DNA sequence: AGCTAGCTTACCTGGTGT
RNA sequence: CCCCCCCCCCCCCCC
DNA sequence: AAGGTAAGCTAGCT
């Protein structure tokens, strides 16, 4: 996972921008929209590649308004999480319910019940931790999580993860 | 919803049912993440999955070259790696893109292989395996000691590779690992 | 009904006349590829008259002392008499004018000469005669090769269909057949020299203008030629007083006959046979 | 209409016609529709959870759609449904339903003629879906038995089983909205139930129905029989709600309540101690209203009259042309930016001009965008206002909200910004479309140049009279004002009066010199006609383009 | 005033396509609908404010388009659906000529 | 010969009332009535029964009965007729619409 | 299938610009100029968008291309610069 | 009682405004 | 749903 | 105080 996908946005440009710095404005409008965005379909569109070689093609002029529509062909780095993907990450939050791990652009939440039964919460620590006879999971620790499922919300993807199984947990 | 991005995959989605299936490590990723992809030239091209180390370098490269283009139009190591990257982002990105800043810090902090030289050698090694781009990316991103660790965390590998061949590869990777 | 049946007919970028299915109705609009507004009734000279009258008008025989071009007509006059290589060109010219006359008498069986065609040639010559202040007294600076080849070459530039292939190229020839019959009859050597007293400068200007005008005359792709035709038949039918007076056969006419035709009426009022 | 939507704007490239599966109708539906009642939820003037906005759209200027929460000029309205107690034929398909029956075995649901019969093979071969169906029908109709066995392609001595049952086929005839068969001392006559036809139609193979006119995705033969009825939203059946304590319900709203009422009586009857041949009474009634709602002008039958003895408009009725949706509202519409008055002639007008009464220029506007070229002209026009002739009526901001220059407290202090629009009055030399109905000519509609003039008539040059076919014995003419720089160009560059001089209809001019001018031209150009110096000088000065050379 | 059928014909004969469109849209009817990209119906629940789209019974909140059509056509389409006929509108070509 | 006769007759009616309509207009009509197998009338049964767009054919004479058959037989309107774009409030492929207009970034920069 | 784009060499449409092209070009450009678009010609005191467009067309400084569709769907592209404006 | 002849029957019939 | 209003051009002969 | 036609279908011709 973390992919390089060929994608293409359609952008309508107003006649005031029909100057020589046109292709410039188009490429910036592309990055304004596309970069930093997040769809369920392709995932997180993190960074657009080969800025110098983005394909503008010809722009068809839209009938009653002046503006012209271009289909900007481009290629970018994407992050799509999946069920069963084993991910390495950092603990960001910690409660009676569990802990959230940051994996690149997204967060994966680990349920109290999706951890070994030996691991138990301790609110009486600064900051709150999950204590075991061996390890202590807290607000800065590195964890290997197995994604159990995803949910696509607005402009992000969140997932639930387990550390119950073998070879998973604190690293 | 919004004026979102299209793809090079052409759908025949006419009235017909939301027949959609699961996404796993049965290597059933989307139709969007099928092995047999089609580039902007129309040619069939194989899926590009990136191990953290690669992805780190791709983004860096892209961003550096972008800064160069922005300087043309203007006319007419470990912790320092993070320090520096956050300065390149200041210059090439919109700042509002919190996703990329978050990714860069993650990639910078979780990459196994620093320099391009080593990443090329990792690519060369896993190249020959004949495994799926996803399994190849996971082998580069996840640090495993035993073939059991690998085959457990990457279930799809199951009968695809010998236990010792996988264990041979795993040694080459731990040897190729940068000393931060 | 006429409008609703023709709405969708239009001239495409291949000069073909098609409907909303892209089915071919006409291979070129109006069998000639010309816009109706750029057409004027013109007389095809070659068609009519005595055979001897035609001969006197067009025949140039440099090998005959009484049938050459008089040296008062052109500068080359004296040196042209008895030239075998030029008579070859002039025999070539005359044989075509005869061929054309035969062809025309096949199309217009009754010998009607006045037909609406593009490019009013009479007016071009008139304007040339005016522009240049032609003096029907002084010998022309034209050569036999200048007239004969000038016309030959102009014909190559009278383009209705562009396209590299024998289908379209034949199609192009077919489309210009009639205009050329007119063009050749009106720009023959004896006429150009004896009738209009054209100079090289003047003859060049006539040729350049026939070309420019000919291309302006061609239909424009996008022409909603279907509605045009419906409205063109439709509106004159509304100004029909009829039926067939209040009285050679008492045949049904006007609106009821047009009605008969469009409906493709099986039992028609006045069935009749004309036996020759 | 109005308000920004992030959705991608596209055009319709294709229209896929088809039929609604009952499953679709229910899946599309926002409300179940249970009560014949419109509202008064125990007298309370507000829509009921039963009919019209049980979530369908607003009756009031409420801004509550409940579904989209959008409000009137935005909400398209959402369909609901009615689950019918018994199946019913769709009036429109009665004959097709009949014909399909005549092609299929009314028992095993097989096609009566196999690809075994030679004439049938020819029919199957037919590429055109419609034509193919007519060939299969004329062949199958007459086949009154479902053969078990048929003579093989090889030797007819050795018959091969093609499949299907043995069963006799009924001779079907239509009686009202029912279909009655006749099998074979003395024939058996019995009505074919809707449920019965449907069960057979559900059993017709995909290969079989696609061999007939049908389509596996978009229109399965089973869908011609209504099971689940879609309820159109208020925008289709407007409640013309005059006052608080007064109704105003649409014809369709009542017909639907009749349908509903018929359906409840049936469901109650059939659930309770159903006296089986009292059920067929309420069932025939449900069929009648579902039929009479789509088409009321049914061939040889009693029209569904209203309380008033007024036939009740079917949906079919609204689409039947010349003033009727398709020809009435779609091929032609009444339009804004249009004017009409009596026409009169003017020798002092240029061929291509049109005299426009000040009144009409002061009403008709052109939306001109504020640009550095006209920023000054437009501010004066705004300052002049809506009542002075060269003036304007509205200013339209970047925001989209309109400033009415006759009521704004800031009407005398508008500082225009590039990009705004000034809806200025129609001015001299603007291109406008002028027309005289019946427009039977391309020349019956031509682009003229404005000339703002006193008096209430449109004024035109007499030589333009001929193509319009207009006299001045009280003729009226229409004027249409283009609103785009793009459409103004269209008028001036394609349909300007001078452009129309020589007509392609007869390859000659369609305008010439007429009447007084034609009469006096003969008179002026006679041999005895001589003009003295005095007159000569004025005759010369009258010609505008004159060289100044006597 | 009526820009009737006959007047539509003269405009066609002239070749004034934009003028014809302006007469029938901006100067009269013109309305904006949200079409589903799958079932092609006017089913979309545009809560255009929260930027929410959705065609339930397609479970589609992604493949949605906006189209500019004469309100009378929107009416026509609802009237055909009212009689069990599906006039599905698509923004791409399936066939090809 | 049917076409030839058909023109001859159509012409003779226009000619009778004195008037003259250019050859091409009558030719075009006579050709439309002919291009199929035989004589296709300018009627409800004639041309309107052609394989054209459901939406365009319904705009003349049989409206509802047409749209009903369109539904039953799952017809697909290609949207290339004038009538369809008129119903759709779209620019028809008529004259001014018979082509498309594009900005070329290349020339834009070249002119500045 | 972008095999519909007909190459520059082997382009059989007219080298001359149709009345409809001219009308749409002028209209388009005038509308664009009207909505504060950059102008490619020195306006010699001009202030009307149509008159500015006619000037742009006369000096062949209109950065537009006509896409001429053929019955099958194929098409030829013609630069306003290259098309002959006789008419 | 195969086919066909004479019925019968829906479909449309210019444009605009008290 | 009526109704009206509009349209009702041209032209019989003689070379 | 319709008219012409294209379906369809009864009655009454083998
Ligand atoms: Mg009058
Ligand atoms: Zn709503
Ligand atoms: Zn059977
Ligand atoms: Zn849908």
Curated annotation (Swiss-Prot), chain B:
GO CC terms for this protein?
cytoplasm; nucleus; P-body; RNA polymerase II, core complex; RPB4-RPB7 complex
Keyword Metal-binding listed? no
Q: Which GO terms describe its biological process?
A: DNA-templated transcription initiation; mRNA processing; nuclear-transcribed mRNA catabolic process, deadenylation-dependent decay; positive regulation of translational initiation; RNA-templated transcription; transcription by RNA polymerase II; transcription elongation by RNA polymerase II; transcription initiation at RNA polymerase II promoter
Region of interest called Disordered, as start-end residue ranges on this chain: 1-23
For this chain, one GO molecular function annotation is: nucleotide binding
Q: Per its UniProt record, what InterPro entries does this chain match? A: HRDC-like_sf (IPR010997), RNA_pol_Rpb4/RPC9_core (IPR006590), Rpb4-like (IPR045222), Rpb4/RPC9 (IPR005574), Rpb4/RPC9_sf (IPR038324)
State the organism of origin.
Saccharomyces cerevisiae (strain ATCC 204508 / S288c)
> How would you summarize the oligomeric state and partners of this protein?
Component of the RNA polymerase II (Pol II) complex consisting of 12 subunits. RPB4 and RPB7 form a dissociable subcomplex associated with the 10-subunit Pol II core complex. In exponentially proliferating cells, only approximately 20 % of the Pol II complexes contain the RPB4-RPB7 subcomplex. In starving cells, that enter stationary phase, RPB4-RPB7 is associated with Pol II in a stoechiometric manner. The RPB4-RPB7 subcomplex probably associates with TFG1. Interacts with LSM2 and PAT1.
Compartments, record wording: Nucleus; Cytoplasm; Cytoplasm, P-body
Q: Which family does it belong to?
A: Belongs to the eukaryotic RPB4 RNA polymerase subunit family.
Q: Which gene encodes it?
A: RPB4
* Positions of modified residues (N-acetylmethionine): 1
**Predominant location category:** nucleus
UniProtKB/Swiss-Prot annotation, chain E:
Domain of life assignment: Eukaryota
Q: Which locations, inside or outside the cell, does it occupy?
A: Nucleus
Where do the annotations place Zn(2+) binding?
36, 39, 55, 58
Mark the C4-type zinc finger spans by residue number: 36-58
The residues forming a coiled coil are none
Family per record: Belongs to the RNA polymerase beta chain family.
Assembly behavior? Component of the RNA polymerase II (Pol II) complex consisting of 12 subunits.
Query: What job does the chain carry out?
Result: DNA-dependent RNA polymerase catalyzes the transcription of DNA into RNA using the four ribonucleoside triphosphates as substrates. Second largest component of RNA polymerases II which synthesizes mRNA precursors and many functional non-coding RNAs. Proposed to contribute to the polymerase catalytic activity and forms the polymerase active center together with the largest subunit. Pol II is the central component of the basal RNA polymerase II transcription machinery.
Leftover remarks: The binding of ribonucleoside triphosphate to the RNA polymerase II transcribing complex probably involves a two-step mechanism. The initial binding seems to occur at the entry (E) site and involves a magnesium ion coordinated by three conserved aspartate residues of the two largest RNA Pol II subunits.
Protein name (Swiss-Prot/TrEMBL)? DNA-directed RNA polymerase II subunit RPB2
- What species does this protein belong to? Saccharomyces cerevisiae (strain ATCC 204508 / S288c)
Swiss-Prot record, chain F:
What does the entry report about post-translational modification of this chain? The tandem 7 residues repeats in the C-terminal domain (CTD) can be highly phosphorylated. The phosphorylation activates Pol II. Phosphorylation occurs mainly at residues 'Ser-2' and 'Ser-5' of the heptapeptide repeat. The phosphorylated form of Pol II appears to carry, on average, one phosphate per repeat. The phosphorylation state is believed to result from the balanced action of site-specific CTD kinases and phosphatases, and a 'CTD code' that specifies the position of Pol II within the transcription cycle has been proposed.
The location annotated for the cross-link Glycyl lysine isopeptide (Lys-Gly) (interchain with G-Cter in ubiquitin) is 8
User: Which compartments does it reside in?
Assistant: Nucleus
Q: Which domain of life does the UniProt lineage start with?
A: Eukaryota
**Family, per entry:** Belongs to the RNA polymerase beta' chain family.
Cite the record's note on assembly: Component of the RNA polymerase II (Pol II) complex consisting of 12 subunits. Interacts with DEF1; the interaction is direct and serves to bridge RPB1 to the Elongin complex in a DNA-damaged dependent manner. Interacts with the Elongin subunit ELA1. Interacts with the Elongin subunit ELC1. Interacts with ASK10. Interacts with ESS1. Interacts with RTT103. Interacts with SHE2.
Which comment does the entry carry about domains?
A: The C-terminal domain (CTD) serves as a platform for assembly of factors that regulate transcription initiation, elongation, termination and mRNA processing.
What's the protein name? Answer: DNA-directed RNA polymerase II subunit RPB1
Q: Which organism is it from?
A: Saccharomyces cerevisiae (strain ATCC 204508 / S288c)
- Location of this fragment in the whole protein: 1343 to 1454 of 1733
Curated annotation (Swiss-Prot), chain G:
Q: Does the keyword Cell cycle apply?
A: no
- Coiled-coil annotated spans: none
State the name under which the record lists this protein. Answer: DNA-directed RNA polymerases I, II, and III subunit RPABC2
Other noteworthy facts: Present with 6090 molecules/cell in log phase SD medium.
What GO biological process terms are annotated to this protein in UniProt? Answer: nucleolar large rRNA transcription by RNA polymerase I; ribosome biogenesis; RNA-templated transcription; termination of RNA polymerase I transcription; termination of RNA polymerase III transcription; transcription by RNA polymerase I; transcription by RNA polymerase II; transcription by RNA polymerase III
Q: What does this protein do?
A: DNA-dependent RNA polymerases catalyze the transcription of DNA into RNA using the four ribonucleoside triphosphates as substrates. Common component of RNA polymerases I, II and III which synthesize ribosomal RNA precursors, mRNA precursors and many functional non-coding RNAs, and small RNAs, such as 5S rRNA and tRNAs, respectively. Pol II is the central component of the basal RNA polymerase II transcription machinery. RNA polymerases are composed of mobile elements that move relative to each other.
Q: Does the keyword Cell membrane apply?
A: no
Its subcellular locations are:
Cytoplasm; Nucleus
Query: What does the entry list under GO cellular component?
Result: cytoplasm; nucleoplasm; nucleus; RNA polymerase I complex; RNA polymerase II, core complex; RNA polymerase III complex
Region ranges (Leucine-zipper)? 43-64
What GO annotations for molecular function exist for this entry?
A: DNA binding; DNA-directed RNA polymerase activity
- Which UniProt keywords are given for this protein, alphabetically ordered? Cytoplasm, DNA-directed RNA polymerase, Nucleus, Phosphoprotein, Ribosome biogenesis, Transcription
The full protein's residues present here are 69 to 155 of 155
């Amino acid at each position: 996972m973390f992919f390089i996908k060929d994608l293409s946005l359609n952008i309508t440009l107003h006649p005031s921008f029909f100057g020589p710095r046109m292709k410039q404005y188009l490429k910036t409008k592309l990055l304004e929209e596309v970069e930093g965005s997040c769809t369920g379909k392709f995932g997180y569109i993190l960074c657009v590649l080969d800025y110098d070689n983005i394909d503008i093609q010809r722009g068809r002029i839209l009938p009653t308004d002046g503006s012209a529509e271009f289909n900007v062909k481009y290629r970018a780095v994407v992050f799509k999480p999946f069920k069963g993907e084993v991910v390495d990450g950092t603990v960001v939050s910690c409660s009676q319910h569990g802990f959230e791990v940051q994996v690149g652009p997204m967060k994966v939440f680990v349920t109290k019940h999706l951890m070994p039964q030996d691991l138990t919460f301790n609110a009486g620590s600064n900051p709150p931790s999950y204590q075991s006879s061996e390890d202590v999971i807290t607000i800065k620790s590195r964890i290997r999580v197995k994604i159990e499922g995803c949910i696509s919300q607005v402009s992000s993807i969140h997932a639930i993860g387990s550390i119950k199984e073998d070879y998973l947990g604190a690293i | 919803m919004n004026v979102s991005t299209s793809t090079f995959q052409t759908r025949r989605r006419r009235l017909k049912k939301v027949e959609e299936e699961e996404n796993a490590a049965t290597l059933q990723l989307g139709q969007e993440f099928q092995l047999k992809q089609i580039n902007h030239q129309g040619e069939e091209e194989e899926l590009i999955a990136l191990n953290l180390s690669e992805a780190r370098l791709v983004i860096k490269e892209a961003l550096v070259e972008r800064r160069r283009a922005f300087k043309r139009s203007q006319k007419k190591t470990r912790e320092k790696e993070l320090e520096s990257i956050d300065v390149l982002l200041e210059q090439t990105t919109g700042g509002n893109n919190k996703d990329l800043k978050n990714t860069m810090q993650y990639l910078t902090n979780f990459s196994r292989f620093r320099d391009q030289e080593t990443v090329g050698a990792v690519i060369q090694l896993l190249k020959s395996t004949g495994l799926h781009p996803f399994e190849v990316a996971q082998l580069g991103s996840l640090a495993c000691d035993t073939a059991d660790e690998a085959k457990t965390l990457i279930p799809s590998l199951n009968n695809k590779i010998s236990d010792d061949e996988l264990e041979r590869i795993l040694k080459e990777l731990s040897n190729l690992e940068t000393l931060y | 009904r006429l409008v609703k049946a023709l709405e969708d007919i239009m001239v495409h970028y291949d000069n073909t006349t098609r409907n909303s299915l892209g089915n071919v109705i006409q291979f070129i609009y109006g069998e000639d590829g010309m816009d109706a507004a750029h057409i004027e009734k013109q007389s095809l000279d070659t068609i009519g008259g005595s055979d001897a009258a035609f001969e006197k008008r067009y025949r140039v025989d440099l090998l005959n002392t009484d049938h050459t071009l008089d040296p008062s007509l052109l500068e080359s006059g004296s040196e042209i008499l008895g030239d075998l290589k030029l008579q070859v060109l002039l025999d070539e010219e005359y044989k075509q004018l005869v061929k054309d006359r035969k062809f025309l008498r096949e199309v217009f069986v009754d010998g009607e000469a006045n037909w609406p065609l593009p490019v009013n040639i009479r007016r071009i010559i008139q304007n040339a005669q005016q522009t240049f202040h032609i003096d029907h007294t002084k010998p022309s600076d034209l050569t036999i090769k200048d007239i004969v080849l000038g016309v030959k070459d102009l014909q190559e530039n009278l383009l209705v269909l562009r396209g590299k292939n024998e289908i379209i190229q034949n199609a192009q020839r077919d489309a210009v057949t009639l205009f050329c019959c007119l063009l050749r009859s009106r720009l023959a050597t004896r006429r150009v020299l004896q009738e209009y007293r054209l100079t090289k400068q003047a003859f060049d200007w006539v040729l350049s203008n026939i070309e420019a005008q000919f291309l302006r005359s061609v239909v424009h792709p996008g022409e909603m030629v279907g509605v045009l035709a419906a409205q063109s038949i439709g509106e004159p039918a509304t100004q029909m007083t009829l039926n067939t007076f209040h009285f050679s056969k008492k045949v049904t006419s006007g609106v009821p006959r047009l009605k008969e035709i469009l409906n493709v009426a099986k039992n028609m009022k006045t069935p009749s046979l004309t036996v020759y | 209409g109005q308000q920004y939507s992030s959705a991608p704007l596209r055009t319709v490239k294709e229209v896929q016609f088809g039929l609604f599966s009952p499953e679709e109708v229910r899946a599309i539906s926002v409300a179940k529709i249970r009560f014949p009642e419109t509202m008064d939820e125990t007298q309370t003037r507000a829509k009921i959870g039963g009919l019209n906005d049980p979530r369908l759209g607003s009756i009031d200027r409420n801004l509550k759609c409940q579904t989209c929460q959008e409000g009137m000029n935005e909400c398209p309205g959402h369909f609901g449904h009615i689950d019918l107690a018994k199946p019913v034929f769709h009036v429109g398909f009665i004959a097709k339903i009949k014909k399909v029956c005549e092609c299929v075995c009314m028992h095993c649901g097989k096609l009566l003629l196999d690809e075994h019969n030679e004439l049938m093979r020819q029919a199957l071969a037919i590429k055109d879906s419609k034509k193919r169906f007519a060939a299969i029908w004329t062949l199958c109709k007459t086949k009154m038995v479902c053969e078990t066995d048929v003579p093989s392609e090889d030797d007819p001595t050795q018959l091969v089983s093609r499949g299907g049952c043995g069963n006799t086929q009924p001779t079907i005839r239509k009686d009202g909205l029912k279909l009655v068969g006749s099998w074979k001392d003395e024939p058996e006559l019995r009505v074919l139930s809707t449920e019965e036809i449907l069960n057979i139609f559900k059993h017709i193979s995909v290969k079989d129905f696609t061999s007939l006119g049908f389509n596996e995705v978009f229109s399965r033969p089973e869908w011609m029989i209504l099971t689940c009825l879609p309820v159109p939203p208020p925008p289709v059946r407007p409640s013309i709600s005059f006052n608080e304590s007064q109704r105003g319900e649409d014809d369709l709203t009542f017909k639907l309540a009749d349908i509903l009422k018929a359906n409840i009586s049936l469901e109650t009857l059939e659930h309770n101690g159903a006296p089986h041949h009292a059920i067929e009474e309420a069932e025939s009634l449900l069929q009648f209203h579902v039929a009479t709602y789509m088409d009321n002008d049914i061939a040889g039958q009693p029209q569904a009259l209203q309380k008033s003895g007024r036939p009740v408009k079917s949906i079919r009725a609204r689409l039947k042309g010349k003033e009727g949706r398709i020809r009435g509202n779609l091929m032609g519409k009444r339009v804004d930016f249009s004017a009409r008055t009596v026409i009169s002639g003017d020798p002092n007008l240029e061929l291509d001009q049109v005299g426009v009464p000040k009144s009409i220029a002061k009403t008709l506007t052109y939306p001109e965008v504020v640009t550095p070229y006209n920023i000054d002209r437009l501010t004066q026009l705004v300052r002049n206002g809506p009542n002075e002739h060269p003036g304007a009526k509205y200013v339209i901001r970047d925001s989209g909200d309109r400033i009415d220059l006759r009521y704004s407290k800031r009407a005398g202090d508008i500082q225009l910004q590039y990009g705004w629009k000034v809806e200025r009055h129609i001015m001299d030399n603007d291109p406008v479309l002028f027309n005289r109905q019946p427009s039977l000519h391309k020349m019956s509609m031509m682009a003229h140049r404005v000339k703002v003039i006193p008096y209430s008539t449109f004024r035109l040059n007499l030589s333009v009279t001929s193509p319009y076919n207009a006299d001045f014995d009280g003729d009226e003419m229409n004027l249409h004002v283009p609103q785009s720089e793009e459409t103004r160009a269209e008028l001036s560059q394609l349909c300007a009066v001078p452009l129309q001089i020589v007509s392609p209809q007869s390859n000659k001019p369609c305008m010439g010199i007429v009447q007084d001018t034609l009469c006096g031209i003969r008179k002026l150009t006679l041999r005895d006609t001589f003009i003295e110096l005095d007159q000569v000088l004025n005759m010369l000065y009258w010609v505008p383009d004159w060289d100044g050379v006597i | 005033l009526r820009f009737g059928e006959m007047e539509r014909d003269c405009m066609i004969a002239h070749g004034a396509a934009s003028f014809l469109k302006e007469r029938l849209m901006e100067a009269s009817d013109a309305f904006r609908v949200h079409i589903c990209g799958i079932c092609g119906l006017m089913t979309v629940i545009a809560k255009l404010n929260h930027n929410q789209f959705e065609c339930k019974g397609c479970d589609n909140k992604i493949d949605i388009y906006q189209i500019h059509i004469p309100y009378a056509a929107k009416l026509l389409f609802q009237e055909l659906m009212a009689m069990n006929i599906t006039p599905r509108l698509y923004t791409d070509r399936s066939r090809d000529f | 010969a049917g076409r030839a006769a058909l023109y001859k007759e159509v012409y003779n009616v226009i000619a009778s009332d004195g008037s003259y309509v250019n050859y091409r207009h009558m030719a075009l009509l006579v050709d439309v009535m002919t291009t199929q197998g035989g004589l296709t009338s300018v009627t409800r049964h004639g041309f309107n029964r052609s394989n054209t767009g459901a939406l365009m054919r319904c705009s003349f004479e049989e409206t509802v009965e047409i749209l009903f058959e369109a539904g039953a037989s799952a017809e697909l309107d290609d949207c290339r007729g004038v009538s369809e774009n008129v119903i759709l409030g779209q620019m028809a492929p008529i004259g001014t619409g018979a082509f498309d207009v594009m900005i070329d970034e290349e020339s834009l920069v070249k002119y500045m | 299938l972008k095999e519909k784009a007909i190459p520059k060499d082997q382009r059989a449409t007219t080298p001359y610009m149709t009345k409809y092209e001219r009308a749409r070009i002028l209209g388009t450009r005038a509308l664009q100029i009207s909505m504060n678009a950059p102008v490619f010609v020195d306006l010699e005191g001009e202030t009307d968008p149509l008159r500015i467009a006619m000037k742009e067309l006369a000096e062949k400084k209109i950065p537009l291309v006509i896409r001429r569709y053929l019955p099958d769907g194929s098409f030829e592209d013609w630069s306003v610069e290259e098309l002959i404006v006789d008419l």
